[PDB]
Scaffold this active site. Sequence first.
Site, PDB file in Angstrom:
ATOM      1  N   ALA A 170       0.850  -1.182   0.000  1.00  0.00           N
ATOM      2  CA  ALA A 170       0.000   0.000   0.000  1.00  0.00           C
ATOM      3  C   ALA A 170       0.888   1.236   0.000  1.00  0.00           C
ATOM      4  O   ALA A 170       2.102   1.152   0.200  1.00  0.00           O
ATOM      5  CB  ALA A 170      -0.952   0.001   1.200  1.00  0.00           C
ATOM      6  N   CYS A 171       0.263   2.390  -0.216  1.00  0.00           N
ATOM      7  CA  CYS A 171       1.007   3.633  -0.342  1.00  0.00           C
ATOM      8  C   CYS A 171       1.326   4.226   1.026  1.00  0.00           C
ATOM      9  O   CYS A 171       0.587   4.041   1.997  1.00  0.00           O
ATOM     10  CB  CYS A 171       0.221   4.663  -1.160  1.00  0.00           C
ATOM     11  SG  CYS A 171      -0.495   4.077  -2.716  1.00  0.00           S
ATOM     12  N   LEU A 172       2.449   4.945   1.086  1.00  0.00           N
ATOM     13  CA  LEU A 172       2.782   5.832   2.204  1.00  0.00           C
ATOM     14  C   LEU A 172       2.791   5.102   3.549  1.00  0.00           C
ATOM     15  O   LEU A 172       2.298   5.612   4.553  1.00  0.00           O
ATOM     16  CB  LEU A 172       1.825   7.027   2.239  1.00  0.00           C
ATOM     17  CG  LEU A 172       1.790   7.882   0.968  1.00  0.00           C
ATOM     18  CD1 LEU A 172       0.362   8.257   0.591  1.00  0.00           C
ATOM     19  CD2 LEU A 172       2.647   9.128   1.140  1.00  0.00           C
ATOM     20  N   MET A 173       3.390   3.914   3.582  1.00  0.00           N
ATOM     21  CA  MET A 173       3.404   3.091   4.784  1.00  0.00           C
ATOM     22  C   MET A 173       4.755   3.031   5.479  1.00  0.00           C
ATOM     23  O   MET A 173       4.830   2.512   6.598  1.00  0.00           O
ATOM     24  CB  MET A 173       2.951   1.659   4.456  1.00  0.00           C
ATOM     25  CG  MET A 173       1.459   1.500   4.249  1.00  0.00           C
ATOM     26  SD  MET A 173       0.555   2.111   5.685  1.00  0.00           S
ATOM     27  CE  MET A 173      -0.339   3.461   4.969  1.00  0.00           C
TER      28      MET A 173
END
EC number: 3.4.22.8
Length: 459
Positions: A170-173
């Site tokens: 997932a994004c921005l983790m």
Amino acid sequence: KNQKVTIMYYCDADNNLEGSLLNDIEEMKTGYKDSPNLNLIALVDRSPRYSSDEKVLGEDFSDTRLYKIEHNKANRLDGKNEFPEISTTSKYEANMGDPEVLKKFIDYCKSNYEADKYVLIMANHGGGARAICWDDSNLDKNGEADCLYMGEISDHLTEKQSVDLLAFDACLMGTAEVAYQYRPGNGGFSADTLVASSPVVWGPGFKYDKIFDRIKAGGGTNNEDDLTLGGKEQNFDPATITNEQLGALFVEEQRDSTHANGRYDQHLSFYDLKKAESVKRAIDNLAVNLSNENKKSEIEKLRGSGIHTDLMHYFDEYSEGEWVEYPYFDVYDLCEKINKSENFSSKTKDLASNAMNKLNEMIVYSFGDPSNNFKEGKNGLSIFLPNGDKKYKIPHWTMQSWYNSIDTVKYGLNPYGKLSWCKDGQDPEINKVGNWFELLDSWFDKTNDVTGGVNHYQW
Ligand code: NA
Ligand code: NA
Ligand code: NA
């Protein structure tokens, strides 16, 4: 030496990423090599509106199902006792944003596919340390898609569901707050190691076919060079594969897949989470100094504003919405610029250098934009550094009360806080900064009475 490895794929395709995640499952089926030391159990929740594929999982459906993936094969399973709502003929619709569903999935996999090593791949959208896994089938109290908040996952999951490796597809983790949230020894759910990207992940996501094609017995190699481990890319026997080898697999295959298509904005990092606390405390020390020396102006000059920023960041600075929602900057770059700037004392420089040492210890592997002078193993972790005074008129900091330690819903704020990163290390004394959260609150909250300003916390 003869371990078994269970990989639990929490696939939340109940959104616009359904086709991409079905392609990811197809890649898993293609790359998976059958072995008695390996299991791949996937909880797949599809959508009734986007993709209508029937070739990956055998038919077209919109409910939530449990599958076991083998080479060129995906056989549907029964939920048994841990997930009695799911069977081989059920039509059960789950809320992937409910942490109880994730808990039931982990318990099911631990009960029916026991292993010595547990990997948890959570696949969906991502939004920093606020959330993850948005589900379109259940609406929250604002009419929006329900999602998993990090503090919510910590509240509902216990030590019984801890994993050896946690991959966030997932994004921005890849934030320091996220890594600290699930560190080993926090008392509840934890992960020994973390695989995550600090910025957004592109459409294709991970190249699972290559990853699982390298999870094979017999040793040997291909002709491709390994830029994380050095030498030629090796195959790792599922009976002896370690956390570091699996993380290097993720990082290297993502590097190869993204750079093959000229996508040099992509990032991925492997963290040893038992170092996470060591980093947090370090930053906290710096924070205290930054409060005692009144350095808000210098830190704001390092961070920048609008489209003029020189810190290494992981959001689109041309979007004020991303400035408000995901103002995540590279921690190592921040500490390096502090340590090298002439606007800081020797004490601040030394604290920044200690933070850099702890960061280097934590970040085992990482790849990034070479045009940004990316330092592998040093860059690759983000931290929340907002333009709290910028007005949108409403300040940014008042829109960021989710970055909190309190139960925000209980205080009337927007859904969920309870970030252990913000809770641990607070100075109980009033008008006293203890950690990064309190430093930001002292810099951006204009009132600090008992009511706690705009985030209902009195620093
Ligand atoms: Na759903
Ligand atoms: Na390579
Ligand atoms: Na406050």
